[PDB]
């Protein structure tokens, strides 16, 4: 999901 690095990390909401 977002544990590695999709666009999630940029905002760092979920980050997994």
UniProtKB/Swiss-Prot annotation:
Site label Moderately important for binding to nAChR, positions: 10, 15
Site residues (Moderately Important for binding to nAChR), renumbered to this chain: 14
Residue positions, PTM Cysteine amide: 16
Subcellular location: Secreted
Documented effect of changing residue 10 to A: 8-fold decrease in ability to inhibit alpha-3-beta-2 nAChR, decrease in ability to inhibit alpha-6/alpha-3-beta-2-beta-3 nAChR, and loss of ability to inhibit alpha-3-beta-4 nAChR
Domain comment in the entry: The cysteine framework is I (CC-C-C). Alpha4/7 pattern.
Known function: Alpha-conotoxins bind to the nicotinic acetylcholine receptors (nAChR) and inhibit them. This toxin inhibits mammalian alpha-3-beta-2/CHRNA3-CHRNB2 nAChR (IC(50)=9.4 nM (rat), IC(50)=8.8 nM (human)), as well as the subunit chimera alpha-6/alpha-3-beta-2-beta-3 nAChR (CHRNA6/CHRNA3-CHRNB2-CHRNB3)(IC(50)=2.1 nM (rat), IC(50)=1.7 nM (human)). Binds to rat alpha-6/alpha-3-beta-2-beta-3 more rapidly than to alpha-3-beta-2, and dissociates more rapidly from alpha-3-beta-2 than from alpha-6/alpha-3-beta-2-beta-3.
Family affiliation: Belongs to the conotoxin A superfamily.
Protein name: Conotoxin Bt1.8
Segment of the intact protein contained: 21 to 36 of 37
């Amino acid at each position: 999901g977002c544990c590695s690095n999709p666009a999630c990390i940029l905002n760092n909401p979920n980050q997994c």
